[PDB]
C-alpha cells in the first residue's frame, strides 16, 4: 500500500490541503479567517498543524503581514501629501502591491500547483520584493530628496539585480519630474509645487535696506542642493537665466520679448 495510508493514523487530526489553501488565500487577501485570527500582529496558529507545515505557513503569514503593512503605509502616504517624486514612488509601491495581489489571485484561481514547497519557491521573488519595499518604507517617511537620490544611486551600484532595478525605476521617475521642474524654472521662472526640492528660491525678508526691491534682486541660490550629475557651473547658469528673466519681466517691462 501507499505510505499515505500508513501516515494517516498520525495525522488524522490535520487540516486538508484544500482548506489550507482556501484559508491562506484569505490571510493573504486580508479577509477575516476563522482558523487563523489574522489581526495586526497575532495570527494564533492552532496546534494541530505539523511543525514543518507550521513554519511554512508562518513564512507565508509573514509575507502576508508585510504586504498588509505595505498597503497601510501606501494608504497613509496617499492620504498625506509629499513632494511629487515621492508621491510617484508611493504610486509605484502601490502598483507593486496590486501586482502581488493579482499574482496571488491568479495562483488561487488556477490551483495547478499542488506542493506548498513549490508555491513558496515560486513566490519567493515577490516575498523578497515586498521585504525590500517594507524595508524602504520603514525610513521613507524620514528621508529627504537628496538622501533618497543618494540611496537610489547606492542601490543602483549595489550588486543585487532586483534592488538595482527598483532603484533605477525610482531614480528615473524622480529625475523625470526633476527635469520637468528645471524646465519650468528655466522657461517661465516658476517655483510652484517645489516642496523644497529645488536649489533656487526667493528670499523676501529684508533687513531695512531696499525694502521694495529696487536693486535687491531677492533671488537666492543654494550650492549643495544639486545632485552629482549636474555641474555647479550649469546650476549657476540656470540661476542667472531665471534671475535675468525675472529682471526683464519686472523692471524692464519687456513683456513681449520675455513671452
Amino acid at each position: 500500500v501507499t505510505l499515505r495510508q500508513l501516515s494517516n493514523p498520525y495525522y488524522v487530526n490535520t487540516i486538508p490541503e484544500e482548506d489550507i489553501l482556501k484559508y491562506v488565500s484569505y490571510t493573504l487577501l486580508a479577509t477575516t479567517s476563522a482558523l487563523f485570527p489574522f489581526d495586526h500582529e497575532q495570527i494564533q496558529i492552532p496546534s494541530k498543524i505539523p511543525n514543518f507545515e507550521s513554519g511554512l505557513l508562518h513564512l507565508i503569514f509573514e509575507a502576508g503581514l508585510l504586504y498588509q503593512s505595505l498597503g497601510y503605509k501606501v494608504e497613509k502616504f496617499r492620504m498625506l501629501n509629499i513632494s511629487p517624486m515621492k508621491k510617484a514612488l508611493i504610486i509605484e509601491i502601490s502598483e507593486e502591491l496590486q501586482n502581488y495581489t493579482a499574482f496571488v489571485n491568479n495562483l488561487v484561481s488556477s490551483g495547478t500547483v499542488v506542493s506548498l514547497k513549490s508555491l513558496y519557491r515560486e513566490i519567493y521573488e515577490n516575498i523578497i520584493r515586498l521585504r525590500i519595499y517594507c524595508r524602504f518604507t520603514e525610513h521613507l517617511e524620514e528621508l529627504s530628496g537628496d538622501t533618497f537620490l543618494i540611496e537610489l544611486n547606492i542601490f543602483k551600484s549595489h550588486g543585487d539585480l532586483t534592488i538595482r532595478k527598483i532603484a533605477t525605476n525610482l531614480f528615473n521617475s524622480m529625475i523625470s519630474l526633476y527635469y520637468e521642474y528645471l524646465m519650468n524654472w528655466l522657461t517661465k521662472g516658476l517655483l510652484r509645487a517645489t516642496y523644497g526640492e529645488f536649489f533656487i528660491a526667493e528670499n523676501t525678508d529684508t533687513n531695512g535696506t531696499d525694502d521694495d526691491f529696487i536693486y535687491h534682486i531677492p533671488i537666492e541660490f543654494n550650492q549643495e542642493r544639486v545632485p552629482a550629475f549636474i555641474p555647479k557651473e550649469l546650476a549657476y547658469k540656470i540661476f542667472m537665466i531665471g534671475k535675468s528673466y525675472i529682471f526683464l519681466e519686472k523692471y524692464c517691462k519687456e513683456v513681449q520679448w520675455t513671452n
Partner: protein, 390 residues
C-alpha cells in the same frame, strides 16, 4: 500520534537592523520537545520488520523536513542551536530507538540539511553591505543555486517518491541524491564557506601584529593596506582561484565553479574597464584595488589597496604592471578634469579597449597585459598630444 495542545503564536519581529535585508523577519515555531504538537511514537514498535516500512516512511518524511530545513518527529534540534540567534551552530539529534541503518542515513541527511541551513545563514549575513558587493553577489548566487537546483530536485524527486511511489527505499533515495550530485556540490560549497570562515578567523585574530620605485616615480601614490574582518573583492577572487586550482579531476565542478566566479566578478571586470578607459573611480564597497584622495590642493594621492588586489604585486614585472595601470588611470582622470568632460569618448584616439568578460581567462592569459599596454599607450598619446598642442 496524540495531538497535544500547546500555544503556537507567530508575530512580526519589528527588529530588522541587525538582521540583513535578506534575513529572517518572523519568530520560529515551537519545537517538538518544547511545545509538543504530536505525541512521539515509540520507534522500537516500528523497528520490527513488519512495521519497518512504516518506520522508513516516517524517517524519510523527517529527513525531507531536515532537507528543507525544518525539524522532524524523531529528529530534532540540538542544544547548541537556538532559533533566536543566527550565529548559533546548527546540529540535530536523532532518537536512539531508531535502527542504526536509518540512524546513519538520517545522520547523512542531517549533515546535508545542516550544511544547507549554514549556507543559508551565510548568504543571509553576506547580503549586508559590510561584506562588500562582491560577497553580496556571491551570496545571491548561492541563494539562486539553492533555490533553482537543490530544493527543486528535492520537490521533484524525493517528495514524489515518498508520496506516489510504492516499494521505495531510503537507500534508493540516497542513490538518487548521489545521481543528482547536488550533495557533492553542497559539500564543496560548505568546504568553501569553511575556508572563508577560517580566513575570517585568522584576519580577526591578527590584531596586534598587523620600495624605492614609488620614490623614483614622480607620482603622488601610496599604499593603503587596511585589512577587513572579512575578505572582500580581490581577496574572495584569490580564494576562489585557489579553490579552483586545488579542485583536480572534477572538470564539471571546475566548470560550474568558473561560471559562478564569472557571474560574481562580472562587476569587477566592468570596474577595471572603467578605471582603465576613463580613470573614473567608483568604489562604494572598498573593493577596487586603487582609490584616490579628495573624494596638494590640486595633486591628490592615489592609494593602492593590497587587501583587495588581484595579484601579489611582489615581482618587478607585477609592480611595473600595477604602476602602469595606475598611471593610465591618473592620466585619464587628469585629462577628464582638464577638458571638463565626464567621460573620454573612444573617438578621441585610434585605440579601442574591449570590456573584460572572463576574469579567469584574463588572469591566465596575456590579454590582460595586452589591454593594459593598449590603454596605457592610448592615455600617454592623448596626454602628449594635449600638452603639446594646447
Amino acid at each position: 500520534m496524540e495531538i497535544k495542545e500547546v500555544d503556537d503564536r507567530a508575530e512580526l519581529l519589528r527588529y530588522t537592523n541587525n538582521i540583513p535585508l535578506l534575513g529572517k523577519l518572523v519568530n520560529h515555531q515551537p519545537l517538538w520537545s518544547t511545545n509538543p504538537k504530536l505525541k512521539s511514537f515509540s520507534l522500537e514498535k516500528i523497528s520490527a520488520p513488519d512495521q519497518r516500512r512504516v518506520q522508513e516512511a516516517l524517517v524519510v518524511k523527517d529527513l525531507l523536513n531536515v532537507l528543507i530545513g525544518l525539524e522532524g518527529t524523531y529528529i530534532r534540534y540540538f542544544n547548541d542551536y537556538e532559533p533566536s540567534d543566527p550565529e548559533t551552530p546548527i546540529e540535530f539529534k536523532i532518537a536512539k530507538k531508531m535502527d542504526p541503518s536509518f540512524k546513519t542515513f538520517s545522520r547523512r541527511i542531517v549533515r546535508y540539511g545542516k550544511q544547507y541551513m549554514i549556507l543559508t545563514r551565510a548568504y543571509e549575513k553576506w547580503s549586508d553591505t559590510s561584506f562588500g558587493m562582491v560577497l553580496q553577489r556571491f551570496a545571491y548566487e548561492i541563494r539562486r543555486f539553492l533555490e533553482d537546483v537543490y530544493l527543486k530536485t528535492l520537490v521533484e524527486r524525493l517528495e514524489r517518491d515518498f508520496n506516489k511511489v510504492p516499494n521505495f527505499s531510503i537507500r534508493e533515495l540516497e542513490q538518487i541524491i548521489n545521481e543528482t550530485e547536488v550533495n557533492k556540490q553542497m559539500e564543496l560549497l560548505y568546504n568553501i564557506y569553511e575556508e572563508i570562515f577560517r580566513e575570517i578567523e585568522e584576519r580577526r585574530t591578527n590584531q596586534s601584529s598587523q620600495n624605492e620605485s614609488s620614490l623614483h616615480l614622480r607620482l603622488m601614490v601610496a599604499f593603503d593596506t587596511t585589512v577587513y574582518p572579512v575578505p572582500k573583492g580581490g581577496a574572495i577572487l584569490k580564494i576562489f582561484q585557489q579553490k579552483i586550482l586545488e579542485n583536480l579531476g572534477d572538470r564539471s565542478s571546475v566548470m560550474f565553479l568558473k561560471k559562478l566566479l564569472n557571474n560574481i566578478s562580472q562587476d569587477y571586470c566592468t570596474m577595471l574597464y572603467e578605471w582603465l578607459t576613463q580613470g573614473i573611480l567608483n568604489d562604494p564597497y572598498q573593493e577596487f584595488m586603487t582609490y584616490d584622495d579628495l573624494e596638494r590642493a590640486w595633486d591628490t594621492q592615489y592609494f593602492i589597496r593590497k587587501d583587495v588586489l588581484l595579484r601579489d604585486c611582489d615581482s618587478e614585472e607585477d609592480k611595473n604592471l600595477l604602476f602602469k595601470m595606475l598611471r593610465t588611470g591618473i592620466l585619464l582622470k587628469v585629462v577628464r578634469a582638464s577638458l571638463q568632460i565626464p567621460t573620454i569618448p573612444s573617438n578621441s584616439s585610434d585605440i579601442t579597449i574591449q570590456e573584460i568578460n572572463d576574469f579567469a581567462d584574463l588572469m591566465e592569459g596575456s590579454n590582460l597585459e595586452l589591454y593594459v599596454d593598449k590603454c596605457y599607450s592610448r592615455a600617454n598619446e592623448i596626454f602628449l598630444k594635449l600638452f603639446f598642442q594646447g
